[PDB]
Amino acid sequence: FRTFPGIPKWRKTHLTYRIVNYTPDLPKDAVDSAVEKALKVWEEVTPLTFSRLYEGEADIMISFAVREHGDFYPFDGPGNVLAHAYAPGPGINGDAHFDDDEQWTKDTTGTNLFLVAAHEIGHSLGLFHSANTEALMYPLYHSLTDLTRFRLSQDDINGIQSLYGPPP
Ligand SMILES: O=C(O)[C@H](Cc1c[nH]c2ccccc12)NS(=O)(=O)c1ccc(N2CCC(c3ccccc3)CC2)cc1
Ligand SMILES: [Ca+2]
Ligand SMILES: [Ca+2]
Numbered sequence: 001f002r003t004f005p006g007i008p009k010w011r012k013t014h015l016t017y018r019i020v021n022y023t024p025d026l027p028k029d030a031v032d033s034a035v036e037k038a039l040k041v042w043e044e045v046t047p048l049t050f051s052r053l054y055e056g057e058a059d060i061m062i063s064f065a066v067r068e069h070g071d072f073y074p075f076d077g078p079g080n081v082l083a084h085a086y087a088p089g090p091g092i093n094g095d096a097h098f099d100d101d102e103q104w105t106k107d108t109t110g111t112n113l114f115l116v117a118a119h120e121i122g123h124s125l126g127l128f129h130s131a132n133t134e135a136l137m138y139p140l141y142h143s144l145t146d147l148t149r150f151r152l153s154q155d156d157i158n159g160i161q162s163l164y165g166p167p168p
C-alpha cells in the first residue's frame with residue numbers, strides 16, 4: 001500500500017458526503033446504492049462513519065461532470081480517465097468526480113460505478129496506489145466476472161488501518 005505524500009488524513013471519525021448531481025445512465029436508486037456500498041467497504045474496516053447531507057458543504061462532495069468542470073484536471077471524453085478524487089482536507093480535498101462521458105453500469109460488462117467509486121473513496125480517505133494486482137487501490141481499471149466475489153485485499157486493509165486504525 002501507499003499513502004499520499006505528507007500523509008493527509010482526516011482528524012475526525014464522522015465524515016459527511018453529498019451526492020450533488022446524478023448521471024443519466026442509471027436510476028437514482030442504483031447510484032445511491034453504489035455509493036453507499038462503496039462507503040460501507042471502508043466503514044467496516046475502520047472507526048469511520050459516514051452520513052449523508054442533502055444540502056450544504058459535505059466533506060466528500062460527489063458529482064458527475066464532463067470536460068472542464070472547475071478544477072485543474074478536466075475530463076477527457078469517453079475512455080481513459082473515468083473518475084478522480086482528492087486527498088483529505090478542506091474544500092476540493094476529499095471530493096470525488098465522475099466522468100459522465102463514460103457509460104456507467106451496475107453490471108460486470110461496462111464501466112461499473114460501484115468499483116470505481118470504491119477506489120475513488122479510497123483516495124478521499126488518504127490511500128494512494130498499490131502494487132498488489134489484487135488490491136482495490138491498484139491503479140488500473142478492470143472489473144470482475146462475479147461482483148459477489150468482490151473483496152478488499154489485505155493490502156487495502158493494512159493501508160487504511162494504518163491511517164485510522166481498526167474498528168472498535
Ligand atoms: O487512479 C485513479 O482514480 C485515476 C485518476 C488518477 C491518476 N492518478 C491519481 C492520483 C490520485 C487520485 C486519482 C488519480 N482514475 S481511473 O479512472 O484511471 C481509475 C479508476 C478506477 C480504478 N480501479 C482499479 C481497480 C479496481 C478493482 C480492484 C479489484 C477488483 C475489481 C476492480 C476498480 C477501480 C483505477 C483507475
Ligand atoms: Ca471536500
Ligand atoms: Ca474519460
Ligand SMILES: [Ca+2]
Nearest residue numbers: 100101102103
Ligand atoms: Ca454518462
Ligand SMILES: [Zn+2]
Nearest residue numbers: 069071073097
Ligand atoms: Zn474533477
Ligand SMILES: [Zn+2]
Nearest residue numbers: 119123129139
Ligand atoms: Zn486511483
